[PDB]
Every structure is written in structure tokens, then in C-alpha cells.
């Protein structure tokens, strides 16, 4: 085990061993930006594909070529720790190298005159940190992914939703990556129409005539040609045995003396078998079958040159008589059917007079541009750049792959441009669906949805910026002069900077990250939202879009969705779920070869899951890779069925593959309902870190992955020993085998102390290692917020009993004792931010100088000679912190709002280059330079001692070595002075501000919020509720030992809501506390070591084939006492979500710790002091605290400010406003009488600016009488309707 696991071993109850380790949870955010940053020689992904899509460019009649050479990212002057406290954007400059050449005259491939190569800077791109965040304006920002539809071709349908008839209607839809859509819909009248970008209707012959196709090159593709020949008597057609099945007998079918089908006889298999056996070619057809066919090709004459008839006409008797008497030997037609084929092309050709390509182009230009008149050349250019241009219509490799996979093509590579045969193959696939031999697809399948990360959205925004820059330089180079000045200032970096500031700033997917919990940060980073730019609308969603498809096994967690307006669209990614190359999702599966489960894994996509059969993870093995049972449940194509032993092809990896990392931390997940687990997973994300976060007794084991995967703790980069322990920094000296020959030496880890998060929650990192402790790589060093020795510690645990206690737990309420208040458990520190902006002001600018009027004599004792409040003074809401004067004397001092009272802990002063503070910012700069000097002195004292040891060990070869080390010491002191000057220029540099401000001071207040009746506390199973009354200690129930119960819950929610996993969690916590009390009983008195080690070995060997298998014989005598100290408060239990502990193991753990089997001990009353008639279920449960404090909800207003557009009070808590009296409250008042109640509600309290003052004066003088008055909102409405051309007045 590692050094962290040897401090406290968490007992596991899993019966099945794991084969694949849990990977990095932030891999979907880190690898995409890593591929976006680095360069690739193929130019497929990253900035190379964005620069290759624009470059090279060529101007018309200019002979100027601006090509691409290379590029290189720059280093920022500020790190991550400085932009979070300064306010600047953490970004890096982009350095690109271009080359502009010029050709000669009348030579397109001539020689050059001169080369123009330089280094051009185009904008600063924001760099991603190691945690996956972006510092835009001093706040860490996380851009979530986007779940959109993959580019290609799909087939939708409606179940008679448009027409009143009961039938089906199919439609094809082509979705490109960047271009126009192409809809091919049907009709109930058997027609085809084309819809492009939701424009007007257009038949399919116009898009076919515009692709250089004649009439004879259309009907031969969708139908089979039938050729008639002239014989002596009873002229005949050819016969196919597979083309006369499903039609009634129209005549007497007879050939060569044997009757096949008589008159009115249905075709059976024997008649068609005899027809296939005979296969004769001379069979006659009578004359009434000729007129039912149509014309396929127009008949031309070889003697007179005159046409007989046109194309797609009706066959008549005079026409066939003229065709027989003229000499036309070949008579062509097509085949008509009702159950096998369909004459849709013949029906489409008779609903519009469009015959040639000219009228088709006129109709195209009329549908595209209804205002401009049609023409020939511009319409041809429009049809050229609609679908046959890579600059306006381009697809990626995933679009070409989905286009070729839907049309049964073996090629998965293409050019990304549409051709003429693609529409033919789409229409041929669409006809077979309507005919009956086709199948329909679905949108909700995960094989048709694609996840777009930030590395593709940033590439698209950079491509938009690059095409804007090349359009601007193309419009500039059309009239500018050449070989004049170096191409460095002609490229404007302002559109690219504006594009990346619009993308990384105000965007639908670029939202803030709530830093109230590390699990909340991990869930926000691993968030797959279907909304955003290029997706769908939340208000325009339906039933099936919010519904989850059964193909979401292992890729989407089914119990983590925000309930409310957007449920099923902001779903999270699972644990073992990984992205694909094209942008799909894949899950690992154990390969099963001839019954032997191989330990290797294979990632299968969504479309590859249904092609194979996958078994379940809950399958017993005989310790050899074989199945101990013959019949096992599997899944074939989306349903559960029983399969054999040989037919098993794959197997799941683990039981935690379906749920995410937010739902994996809930113990006993299989005993809870889906809604209760969903509410518990939603409330676990809203956890608030307490003062002393302690370990959970009943856990899962993935809390360490949440602790070490999120950047909220401090881990060791290289293994070594700890040299200096402090609350501010940690000095660790590395070992010899990991020491680089060119490195600086030891490593210094800085600890953030009392910083402000995005949710006004205090976060800090406290160290846990001792002085002189050996650590290794990957070991934790400091516990951050909600961290206990490298484990996620959300809330606290206490005694929980399920009994009704005098109605204080009626619906969902929680009765908490005073022992929780006295032990300082649920106290939370909150840090707020108060700023003061001093801008320009005419006739005296805003300053923070002395002699501020309208003050008191007590305000001078709290402020300095300047006016800034001291750090560490307890203030009250309504005092004066920053006294700012505004000459116009007018006072504009910053005051504290009522309702908050904290302590000033940090004052940040940001001054410009014009006005510099003399006593506030200068001492901050001195403290930062002193801290940096102390850090570099502590880092180089070891190197100075090593150089002193070297000069003592060394002191001609020895004289040359002495001169070598002497000049090395001179070079070391020279680079020391250079590094000191660089640090002095870096710290004392300054910053840039907005144009208009002078200086910005910020005061941080730290308020200590305790637990009070009115707060909201819950658990991990969905037992939400509030606190009613803080009960005393002597009033709470107690056992025979006298220990009072801290929290009394309500057992009425157990039959109503199906969450009984909390009862198993309470019993397991009671057993763990009994084991911890039996351990602590051997530590309160003087005991030995071997008996305690034997009891620890007995506590870790319950049996039932566990996978922990610890060995206490290898532990020394110094670590056993530390383990007993860490286990004297309770032993942590690891319980997976589906491989959890059974009830018999809980009964054995209860019997081991001298506890009863049922777990219900008899409790006595606290007030009266008598035994209850029934035993009460009492134990230990892990409770949490939500961010629904009662101090942020209570608000009251009697008199306040009003609006200016209307005479109505305001609304909210930050502004002094009142509550809203909605229309339903007016309806409820109208249900009663409430005449004078409604007269005073909306006329006296809101309107009547001269009447409410009279009402206030009447209340002051002691008169409860009001006036009706006149509402001002009705006067505003009367003035608003009179502003139009409508007159309205009042009549008397």
C-alpha cells in the first residue's frame, strides 16, 4: 500500500475484482485542448487544419501569393496564481510566420523578386490550466461539451400527424456540417418535393434537370425498361418470373399447350414454379394491357424527322396504330405496380411544366431570390456555389463516414464535397422505404449523435476569425499597392481577439463553475449539455428528446439530470465512458473467447453494440475465466434475453460503468428508487464544506479519485521526504533516484489560505504531513475543502433515530439537538467581495482623501489617515469602510448593506499609472517581494550549503577545478541577480484597467454562519428537509449508556418514498461506530499491541470472499498505533453501488462489535424518563448541509424605493423590494369578498403617490382610514395607447 492508505485502511466489501482502473475523469476536457494546441504533421486536427483551410490564397489579376510557413505559441508574462488576484485574462500570444512572394508580368508560374517573411502577432488565446478551467476576468470558467446530431443523411417519419388519414409518410433529410439542408418529403398523393432551408415547395425534377440530365437519363434509373417487338399476330412483351407476384389475372396465361393461370385465378407457388421450370420466352398478351402503360422515351422518325409523341404521355389506340404502321420496331415503356414498385417519377413529371434546364434555373433563382429577376449567369454561379464549392459547403470526415455508411458503401474516406450520384443514391434509398423493403432510422440513437468539445468549437471560432481576416485582406489588396511595406501591420488582430472574447465570454456554453464542492467541479467539467449554439432549444423540446434511449448503457448516467425545465438534456458522462475519434462515445468490454474471459478490453461504439452480444458484470466465475452457469442474461440488440454459454461474445468491465462519478458515491444504490437517487445525486452536488469535515463511515471507495482527480488538493510530483512543514508552504526534498541533473533541487508547494470561491464560500488548504515523513509520487500533501486524508468529506455524521418526536418531524423536518451546535460542526465561513470604483467626475474627480463630511467621531477610530478600513476589525452592516469624496460637498462612501456582519481579511488596491497610493499598495508590494525573497532564500540555502561542502571537499588539476567551481559560482551569482531583477520587474510591473477609472479598491468580508432553525439539511438518499427547533441535551432520548441522540428523523418517509438504503447505511454506520468504540476501548486504557493487532485482523476478515486481503503482519509497531488512532472514531466501510455488502455481513459486523442483531435498542424518554413501548432504530448516518441558508431567504420591506418607468415597488433581496402579488392571488381574493383588501393591495401600497403618503400620515396619527385615489399604472397605459393612433378617454 501507499503512505496514504497505510494511515487508514478502508474496509472493502466487494466480491468481484476489478480489471480496469478508473481513468482520469477530466480527460474529455484536457485531451481536446491538447490536440488543439499542439501541431500535427497530417494537418487533421488543431490549428493546422484551421490555417490550412484558408491558406494558400490567391488574388485576381495581382499575382501575389501569401503562403504559410510555421507558427509558435508564446509564453505569458503572468501565471495562473496572478490573474486570479489581478483581473487580467490568462492568455498567451500567438506568433505566426508568413511568406509573401510576387510573380513577374504575364507569367502565372514565374520567378519571384523578393521574399517577405516576418513574425506576425494575431490575438491572444486563453490557455487551459491543469484542472480544466479558464481565467477570463479573474474567475475560473469551464466550457461544457455539446451533444448535437452527426452530419449525414437520416430518414424521419410522422404517424399521420399532418394528414387526417391513417397511414405513414417518410421523409429524407441531409444535414451537412457547414451548409444548407436538403429535405426530400413524400405526399399522400404519391409525389416528391424538395425543401431547402425551409423555403417554398419545389418538385424533384428541377434539381434533377439542373445536374445536366435529359429526360431519357431519368426514367431509366428508377424503373425497368420494357421493350416491345412487332410479331405476326398477338404482339408480346418479355416476361420476368420475379415481376408478376401480387397482381390479379388480367387474361388467360397460356404457352405451349399448358395453361399456367386461367381467368380470375390467383398465382400460387405451383404456377410460378412451373413457369420457372418451363422458362419459355414466347407468351402472348392481349390488347387491353397496352393502354395501361406510359411513354418512356420520345419517338423520333428516321425518314421525315418529325416526332411521333412527347415524353411521359398516355398510350392510345391511334398512337400504337401509327407506331405499328410507321415502322417503329422498339417500343419502350416502364413497369407499374402498387405493392412492389411505385410510379412516383411519372406522377412528379405531370404536376409542373418544367421541362428544360433553363426553366429549372429560373425556378431555382425564383425560389432562392423572390425579389430579384432571374437570369442565366448569376443563377449558374448560384447553383455552382450552393453545393459544389468547398468554401461555402464543406463536410468533415465524420459526415462523409455517416453518408457512406447509410448508403451501404465500404469506403470511409472522401473529399467532403457532394456529387451528382449522391442525390441519386439518397433517392434510391428513400424509394425502398416507401416500397416496403426499407427500414427507418431514429434520432435518439447514440450512433447518430456526436459530442463536440471545446477543441472543436475554438477551432470553428478561429476559422471564422481567419476567414474574416482573409476577407478583409482580400478587400484591401484589391485596391492597395504592393511591395510597399512589410506585411506585419496589415493583419488586424482585433477581429480574432473579438471573436475569442465573444466565444470565451458571453456564450451559451461558456458558463461559470461553482466551486462549492470538488464533486460539483468534476460534475460541471463532465457535463454533456444538448443546448447551446448549433443545437436545439429548451422550450422547443418534446417528449422523446427528453426521454433516454436504451442505447445509453455505460455512456450516460440515468440518475443524474436536473429536474425542472431541462431534464434529460444536461445529462452527465459515465465513469468508464470515453470519446471516439469521430466524436462518438465508446465503452470498454472484456473480450470473451470460447468461454474464457480475457482480461483485455475493447472499446465498442453505439452502432457496434447492437451487432454483438454482451453479457453482464454480475456473473460468478470459477477463478479461471469460465462461467459457472450455463444460462446467463445478456443483451442482443436492446432487450434482455437468456443466452447460452458458448454464445457469449463480450462482458462488462465493472458494475460502476452505468452510473457517473456523482451517483457512484451513494451507498446502497440498488435499494433506492430512481427519483430518490436522482434527488440525492442532485443534492450531493450542492454540498457546502463545514468547519471540520470528517470521514464518512459508510462510503464507496471512489472518494479518493474525486479527491486526487480535481485540482483542489496538493499532490507530490516527485518522491522524497518532507523538510519543512508550515500552514503557508510545504518544503519537500526529493530523493536521489528522481533528482534531475539540471533541476533546481527541492520542490516548494504553495498553499492557498482563505480564498473566495464563485459561490461566496471560503476555501483553503491545510497540511496533513508531519516533520520528516517519507512520501512518494502521487501522494497527497494538503487537504483542501471537503478533504479528509485524501478522501471526499462532504458533511458530518451523528446519531440518527427514526421516531416521531412530538410532531417536530411532521412532513420532512429534522430535529437537531444542541450537542451539534455546541461541538462546532455545521459552522460555515462565507467570504464576500465589496468593491469601490472611482471614475472621472467634472469639477473635482472622485478621490479617497481626508475631511469627509457627514460622519461621526467614532468613524475616525476605525479608519486610518487615508480612509481604508483595517484588516481584522469586526464591522457591522451600515458602517463606513471606504470613504470616497465626490466634488460637485457630496459624499459617495462605500457602506455595508444591512444583513451581513463580518471581519475584513484582505484589501486589494489596484492603481493605474497616473495615481499611485503611498501607504496601501506599497506595503502590499513590499510583502509580496519579501515573500518571494524568503522563498528564493529557502530554495537556494541548500544549494549554497552544497557549494560550501564542495569547496570544503575540493580544497594542476585541483587548481583548475577550483577555478572551475569559482567561475561557476560567479555565473550562479550573475543568474541570481538576473532572476532577482526579473522578479522585481515582474512583481512591480502593474496592470491595465478600463478607460475612465482611476483606482479600484476591494474589501473582503468574512462572515461566520452557524446552524440555526430555518436552514436546509439532507442526506445522500433524497431525505430533504429543514430544522425546526434546536432541542436541549437533556430533552433528547438516550440509551442505557446515557448517550443522547443528536438527530431525530421521521420514519414515515420510508413507506412513501422507496429509499430504504438509508436504513442499511444507518445500520452499517452503527456497526462501524461499534467497531470504532471497541478499538477506542483498547486505547483509553493501557493495552498491548498484539491483541489490538489481532482484533484489527479479526475486523478485516469477516469472509464471504472479499477482495481487500490486507496483511497486518507486515506492519511495524509505530504504524499500528497510528492506524488505531485513525480508527478510534470509526472504521470506514467501502460499499459499491451494485457490488455492495449483503445483510448477513452487516449482521456479522453487528455481532462482532457487541451490538444486537436487529439494531433496534430500547431508548428512554428525555423529558419524562421512561422506556418507550417499541424499540427505536438508532444508528449513525452521514448527513449533509445544502446552500439554502435562512439568512439569504428572509427579507421584509415596509417602505422603500420605487421605479421610474412606473410607480411600483422593486423586487428582490439585494435591492430593497417587496413581494409580488400575482394574478392568482387576485383570483383567490376574488373568491372571497375582499373588496377593501383588494382596494388597498394595488392602489394604496403600489400606486397613488399622493395617497400612500396620506395613508402613512394616517397610520402615524392613528387613523385606519384610506383613500381610493387613482392608479398611476392606468395613467401610464392611457398615455401609452394615446401615443398610437387610437384615442381613449374617461367619460363622466
Amino acid at each position: 500500500y501507499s503512505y496514504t492508505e497505510k494511515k487508514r485502511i478502508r474496509k472493502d466489501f466487494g466480491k468481484r475484482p476489478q480489471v480496469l482502473d478508473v481513468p482520469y475523469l477530466l480527460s474529455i476536457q484536457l485531451d481536446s485542448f491538447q490536440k488543439f494546441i499542439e501541431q500535427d504533421p497530417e494537418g487533421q486536427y488543431g490549428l493546422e487544419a484551421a490555417f490550412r483551410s484558408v491558406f494558400p490564397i490567391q488574388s485576381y489579376s495581382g499575382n501575389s501569393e501569401l503562403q504559410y510557413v510555421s507558427y509558435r505559441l508564446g509564453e505569458p508574462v503572468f501565471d495562473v496564481q496572478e490573474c486570479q488576484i489581478r483581473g487580467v485574462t490568462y492568455s498567451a500570444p500567438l506568433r505566426v510566420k508568413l511568406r509573401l512572394v510576387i510573380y513577374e508580368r504575364e507569367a502565372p508560374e514565374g520567378t519571384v523578386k523578393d521574399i517577405k517573411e516576418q513574425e506576425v502577432y494575431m490575438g491572444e488565446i486563453p490557455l487551459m490550466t491543469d484542472n480544466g478551467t479558464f481565467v477570463i476576468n479573474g474567475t475560473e470558467r469551464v466550457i461544457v461539451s455539446q451533444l448535437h446530431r452527426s452530419p449525414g443523411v437520416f430518414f424521419d417519419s410522422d404517424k399521420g400527424k399532418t394528414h387526417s388519414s391513417g397511414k405513414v409518410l417518410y421523409n429524407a433529410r441531409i444535414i451537412p456540417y457547414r451548409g444548407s439542408w436538403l429535405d426530400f418529403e413524400f405526399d399522400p398523393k404519391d409525389n416528391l418535393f424538395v425543401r431547402i432551408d425551409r423555403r417554398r415547395k419545389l418538385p424533384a425534377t428541377i434539381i434533377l434537370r439542373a445536374l445536366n440530365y435529359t429526360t431519357e437519363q431519368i426514367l431509366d434509373l428508377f424503373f425497368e425498361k420494357v421493350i416491345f417487338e412487332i410479331r405476326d399476330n398477338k404482339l408480346q412483351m418479355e416476361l420476368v418470373p420475379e415481376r408478376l407476384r401480387g397482381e390479379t389475372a388480367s387474361f388467360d396465361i397460356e404457352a405451349n399447350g399448358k395453361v399456367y393461370v386461367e381467368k380470375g385465378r390467383r398465382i400460387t407457388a405451383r404456377h410460378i414454379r412451373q413457369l420457372e421450370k418451363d422458362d419459355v420466352k414466347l407468351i402472348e398478351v392481349p390488347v387491353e394491357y397496352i393502354a395501361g402503360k406510359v411513354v418512356a422515351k420520345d419517338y423520333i422518325d428516321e425518314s421525315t424527322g418529325e416526332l411521333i409523341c412527347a415524353a411521359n404521355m398516355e398510350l392510345s389506340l391511334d398512337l400504337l396504330a401509327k407506331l405499328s404502321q410507321s415502322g417503329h420496331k422498339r417500343i419502350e415503356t416502364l413497369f407499374t405496380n402498387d405493392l412492389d414498385h411505385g410510379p412516383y417519377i411519372s406522377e412528379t413529371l405531370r404536376v409542373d411544366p418544367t421541362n428544360d434546364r433553363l426553366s429549372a434555373l429560373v425556378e431555382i433563382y425564383r425560389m432562392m431570390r423572390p425579389g430579384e429577376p432571374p437570369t442565366r449567369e448569376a443563377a449558374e454561379s448560384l447553383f455552382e456555389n450552393l453545393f459544389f464549392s468547398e468554401d461555402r459547403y464543406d463536410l468533415s470526415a465524420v459526415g462523409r463516414m455517416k453518408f457512406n455508411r447509410s448508403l451501404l458503401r465500404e469506403e470511409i474516406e472522401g473529399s467532403g464535397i457532394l456529387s451528382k450520384d449522391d442525390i441519386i443514391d439518397v433517392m434510391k434509398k428513400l424509394i425502398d422505404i416507401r416500397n416496403g423493403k426499407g427500414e427507418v432510422d431514429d434520432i435518439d440513437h447514440l450512433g447518430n449523435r456526436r459530442i463536440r468539445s471545446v477543441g472543436e468549437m475554438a477551432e470553428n471560432q478561429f476559422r471564422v476569425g481567419l476567414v474574416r481576416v482573409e476577407r478583409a485582406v482580400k478587400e484591401r489588396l484589391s485596391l492597395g499597392d504592393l511591395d510597399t511595406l512589410m506585411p506585419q501591420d496589415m493583419i488586424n488582430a482585433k477581429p480574432i481577439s473579438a471573436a475569442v472574447k465573444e466565444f470565451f465570454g458571453s456564450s451559451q456554453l461558456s458558463q461559470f463553475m461553482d466551486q462549492n464542492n470538488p464533486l460539483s467541479e468534476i460534475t460541471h467539467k463532465r457535463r454533456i449539455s444538448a443546448l447551446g449554439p448549433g443545437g436545439l432549444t429548451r422550450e422547443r423540446a418534446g417528449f422523446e428528446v427528453r426521454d433516454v434511449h436504451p442505447t445509453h448503457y455505460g455512456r450516460v448516467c440515468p440518475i443524474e439530470t436536473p429536474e425542472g425545465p431541462n431534464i434529460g438534456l444536461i445529462n452527465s458522462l459515465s465513469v468508464y465512458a470515453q470519446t471516439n475519434e469521430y466524436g462518438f462515445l465508446e465503452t470498454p468490454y472484456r473480450k470473451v473467447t470460447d468461454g474464457v474471459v480475457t482480461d483485455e478490453i475493447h472499446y465498442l461504439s453505439a452502432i457496434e453494440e447492437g451487432n454483438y452480444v454482451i453479457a453482464q458484470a454480475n456473473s460468478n466465475l470459477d477463478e479461471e475465466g469460465h462461467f459457472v452457469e450455463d444460462l446467463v442474461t445478456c443483451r442482443s440488440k436492446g432487450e434482455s434475453s437468456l443466452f447460452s454459454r458458448d454464445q457469449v461474445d463480450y462482458m462488462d468491465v465493472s458494475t460502476q460503468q452505468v452510473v457517473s462519478v456523482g451517483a457512484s458515491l451513494i451507498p446502497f444504490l440498488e435499494h433506492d428508487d430512481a427519483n430518490r437517487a436522482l434527488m440525492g445525486a442532485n443534492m450531493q452536488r450542492q454540498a457546502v464544506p463545514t468547519l471540520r469535515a470528517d470521514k464518512p463511515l459508510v462510503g464507496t471507495g471512489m472518494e479518493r479519485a474525486v479527491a486526487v482527480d480535481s485540482g483542489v488538493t496538493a499532490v507530490a510530483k516527485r518522491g522524497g521526504v518532507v523538510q519543512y512543514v508550515d500552514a503557508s508552504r510545504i518544503v519537500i526534498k526529493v530523493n536521489e533516484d528522481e533528482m534531475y541533473p539540471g533541476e533546481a533541487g527541492i520542490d516548494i508547494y504553495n498553499l492557498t489560505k482563505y480564498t473566495r470561491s464563485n459561490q461566496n464560500t471560503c476555501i483553503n488548504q491545510m497540511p496533513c504531513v508531519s516533520l520528516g515523513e517519507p512520501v512518494e509520487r502521487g501522494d497527497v500533501l494538503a487537504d483542501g475543502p471537503s478533504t479528509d486524508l485524501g478522501e471526499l468529506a462532504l458533511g458530518q455524521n451523528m446519531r440518527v433515530a427514526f421516531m416521531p418526536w412530538n410532531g417536530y418531524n411532521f412532513e420532512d423536518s429534522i430535529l437537531v439537538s444542541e450537542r451539534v451546535v455546541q461541538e462546532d460542526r455545521f459552522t460555515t465561513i462565507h467570504i464576500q467581495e465589496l468593491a469601490c470604483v472611482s471614475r472621472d467626475t467634472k469639477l473635482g474627480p472622485e478621490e479617497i482623501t481626508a475631511d469627509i463630511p457627514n460622519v461621526g467621531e467614532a468613524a475616525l477610530s476605525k479608519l486610518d489617515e487615508s480612509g481604508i478600513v483595517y484588516i481584522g476589525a469586526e464591522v457591522t452592516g451600515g458602517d463606513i469602510l471606504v470613504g470616497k469624496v465626490t466634488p460637485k460637498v457630496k459624499d459617495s462612501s462605500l457602506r455595508v448593506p444591512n444583513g451581513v456582519s463580518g471581519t475584513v481579511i484582505d484589501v486589494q488596491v489596484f492603481t493605474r499609472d497616473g495615481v499611485e497610493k503611498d501607504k496601501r499598495a506599497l506595503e502590499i508590494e513590499e510583502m509580496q517581494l519579501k515573500q518571494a525573497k524568503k522563498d528564493l532564500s529557502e530554495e537556494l540555502q541548500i544549494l549554497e550549503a552544497g557549494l560550501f561542502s564542495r569547496i570544503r571537499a575540493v580544497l594542476e588539476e585541483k587548481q583548475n577545478q577550483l577555478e572551475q567551481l569559482a567561475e561557476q559560482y560567479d555565473e550562479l551569482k550573475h543568474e541570481f541577480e538576473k532572476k532577482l531583477e526579473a522578479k522585481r520587474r515582474k512583481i512591480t510591473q502593474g496592470d491595465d484597467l478600463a478607460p475612465g477609472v482611476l483606482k479600484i479598491v476591494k474589501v473582503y468580508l468574512a462572515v461566520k454562519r452557524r446552524i440555526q432553525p430555518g436552514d436546509k439539511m439532507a442526506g445522500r438518499h433524497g431525505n430533504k428537509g429543514v430544522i425546526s427547533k434546536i432541542n436541549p441535551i437533556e430533552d433528547m432520548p438516550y440509551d442505557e449508556n446515557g448517550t443522547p441522540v443528536d438527530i431525530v428523523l421521521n420514519p414515515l418517509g420510508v413507506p412513501s418514498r422507496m429509499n430504504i438504503g438509508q436504513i442499511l447505511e444507518t445500520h452499517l454506520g452503527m456497526a462501524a461506530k461499534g467497531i470504532g468504540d471497541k478499538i477506542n476501548a483498547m486505547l483509553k486504557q493501557q493495552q498491548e499491541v498484539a491483541k489490538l493487532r489481532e482484533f484489527i485482523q479479526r475486523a478485516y476478515d469477516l469472509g464471504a470472499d472479499v477482495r481487500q486481503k490486507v496483511d497486518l503482519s507486515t506492519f511495524s509497531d509505530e504504524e499500528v498505533m497510528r492506524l488505531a488512532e485513525n480508527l478510534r472514531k470509526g472504521m470506514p466501510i467501502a460499499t459499491p453501488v451494485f457490488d455492495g455488502a449483503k445483510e448477513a455481513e452487516i449482521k456479522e459486523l453487528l455481532k462482532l462489535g457487541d451490538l444486537p442483531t436487529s439494531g433496534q435498542i430500547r431508548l428512554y424518554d428525555g423529558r419524562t424518563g421512561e422506556q418507550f413501548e417499541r424499540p427505536v432504530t438508532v444508528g449513525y448516518m452521514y448527513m449533509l448541509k445544502l446552500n439554502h441558508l435562512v439568512d439569504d431567504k428572509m427579507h421584509a420591506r415596509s417602505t422603500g424605493s420605487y421605479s421610474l418607468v412606473t410607480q411600483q415597488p422593486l423586487g428582490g433581496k439585494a435591492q430593497f423590494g417587496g413581494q409580488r402579488f400575482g394574478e392568482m392571488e387576485v383570483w383567490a381574493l376574488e373568491a372571497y369578498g375582499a373588496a377593501y383588501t383588494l382596494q388597498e393591495m394595488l392602489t394604496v401600497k403600489s400606486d397613488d403617490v399622493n395617497g400612500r403618503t396620506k395613508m402613512y400620515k394616517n397610520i402615524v396619527d392613528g387613523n385606519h382610514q384610506m383613500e381610493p385615489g387613482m392608479p398611476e399604472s392606468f395613467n401610464v397605459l392611457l398615455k401609452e395607447i394615446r401615443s398610437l393612433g387610437i384615442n381613449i378617454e374617461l367619460e363622466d
Binding site: 395613467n1275 401610464v1276 398615455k1279 394615446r1282 401615443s1283 393612433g1285
Partner: protein, 49 residues
Amino acid sequence: RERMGHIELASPTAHIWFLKSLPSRIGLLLDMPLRDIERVLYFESYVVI
């Protein structure tokens, strides 16, 4: 709050609430469909007076 102002118009214009009222008031008062009123108001065709 009760004092108002007025803006004169050198060229006359039509109203919107009496044009797209479904049915139109001008389309009901005159013997004309709505598309010809849109053609005259958007300067597409003349009318003989």
C-alpha cells in the same frame, strides 16, 4: 408625465393594426384583396384615379 409631443409627416403613411387585423379593415372596406394593397403600399403597382 402628462405633457406629450407630436411629429408632423410630409408624406402620408398607412397603419399596421388596420392592415393585418385578420381580416383587414381596409381590405373589408374596399373591394380589394390584401396582396394588391401590399403592392400599392410597397410601390409595386399603380391604381387609376
